[PDB]
Design a protein around this ligand. Structure first.
Ligand SMILES: Nc1nc2c(ncn2[C@@H]2O[C@H](COP(=O)(O)OP(=O)(O)OP(=O)(O)O)[C@@H](O)[C@H]2O)c(=O)[nH]1
Ligand SMILES: Nc1nc2c(ncn2[C@@H]2O[C@H](COP(=O)(O)OP(=O)(O)OP(=O)(O)O)[C@@H](O)[C@H]2O)c(=O)[nH]1
Ligand SMILES: Nc1nc2c(ncn2[C@@H]2O[C@H](CO)[C@@H](O)[C@H]2O)c(=O)[nH]1
Ligand SMILES: [Mg+2]
Length: 326
């Protein structure tokens, strides 16, 4: 965990322009391009910011450079702010990340208005700072993010963000499904775009544990996570759940893209030899099901239900297959 991954959890990563909660054109890890209603003005600013003719689309490397520029500007502003500089200078690196996080969300002036919280932070009175931080419009507006940021100030650890990471595979875990889904569905609702969910369940995975032992099976799941990430884009969200069950949430594409990605995943699993560098010859297939929002449903919960039912239909009809919700 680090400040990039922390803000990616809180703000997502997007490689095409989207609209934030106020309707403002944004890209990357929460980089506001403009408040202008003009998409053209947003694209002209994006080209200046990246230093390329982007037509509204950037690479992950570009988004992370833009993010680092935004962190540097937040720190330089903190250091020029008489109320924030002494607190920042006094904090350790993790708690500085929490302060920067607040500046990303609400701006420097907003953070500087946390008079009593800042006092307690400068005095290392962590529990009192956490109580004071929650007495704010910020906490009420975004309580889940504020609780994470507050826990980071209270503890000085990354644990509130690490609890979204699956230890075995390094993928996101089931706790991230709520956050990521709610966020990309809302962004799609504002923008008129599509979100698709793909459920993937390995076929006969118990047979790997039976033949090679559970430690080998766990390494197969780790390699499966790597293969899924290689098969999708950096804006797509890959989660493990549980056991040999994974989800992929597709962002920034449509129904045709969902079909293409699900078929690519199925084919890539079927063609892959697992643990080959360790001398194994493990072969697997998977059953996949997917559904698209808003085409197939206008309920996020139903979207999950339909993709899972489509996957199970594949399981019942021979496995090694992809079904879209009917
Ligand atoms: N459940 C949950 N939803 C979140 C969280 N963070 C962001 N969201 C959802 O993401 C939506 C859109 O986020 P933005 O586009 O950044 O506004 C919000 O309105 C929330 O509903 C979170 O920590 N938990
Ligand atoms: N999100 C996402 N879009 C994809 C992927 N593969 C293809 N596409 C979309 O389909 C188009 C071809 C690309 O320009 C993408 O917009 C993928 O793995 N993830
Ligand atoms: N090796 C291994 N097997 C698992 C893990 N999680 C679930 N499983 C097994 O995968 C099978 C899925 O049906 C079940 O027997 C689970 O016990 C894991 O982390 N490692
Ligand atoms: Mg299975």
């Amino acid at each position: 965990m680090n400040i990039f991954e922390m803000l990616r959890i809180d703000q997502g990563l997007r490689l095409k322009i989207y609209k934030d909660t106020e309707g403002y054109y944004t890209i990357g890890i929460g980089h506001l391009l403009t408040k202008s209603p003009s998409l053209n003005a947003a694209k002209s600013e994006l080209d200046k910011a990246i230093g390329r003719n982007t037509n509204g689309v950037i690479t992950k490397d570009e988004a992370e450079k833009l993010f680092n520029q935004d962190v540097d500007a937040a720190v330089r502003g903190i250091l020029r702010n008489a109320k924030l500089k002494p607190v920042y200078d006094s904090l350790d690196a993790v708690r500085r990340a929490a302060l920067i996080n607040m500046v990303f969300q609400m701006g420097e002036t907003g953070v500087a208005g946390f008079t009593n919280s800042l006092r307690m932070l400068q005095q290392k009175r962590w529990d009192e700072a956490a109580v004071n931080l929650a007495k704010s419009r910020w906490y009420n507006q975004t309580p889940n993010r504020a609780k994470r940021v507050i826990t980071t100030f209270r503890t000085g650890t990354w644990d509130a963000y690490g609890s979204y990471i699956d230890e075995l595979t390094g993928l996101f875990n089931y706790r991230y499904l709520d956050i990521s889904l709610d966020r990309e569905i809302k962004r799609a609702d504002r923008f008129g775009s599509t979100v698709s969910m793909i459920f993937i369940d390995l076929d006969f995975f118990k047979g790997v544990n039976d033949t090679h032992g559970h430690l080998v099976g766990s390494q197969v799941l780790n390699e499966m996570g790597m293969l899924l990430k290689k098969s999708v884009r950096e804006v797509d969200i890959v989660i493990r759940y549980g056991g040999d069950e994974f989800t992929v949430m597709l962002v920034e594409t449509g129904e045709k893209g969902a079909a293409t990605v699900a078929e690519r995943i199925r084919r890539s699993i079927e063609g892959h030899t697992f643990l080959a560098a360790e001398g194994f010859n493990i072969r697997l297939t998977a059953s996949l099901g997917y559904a698209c929002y808003p085409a197939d449903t206008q309920s996020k919960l139903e979207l999950l239900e339909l993709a899972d039912k489509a996957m199970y239909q594949g399981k019942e009809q021979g496995k090694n297959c992809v079904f879209r919700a009917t």
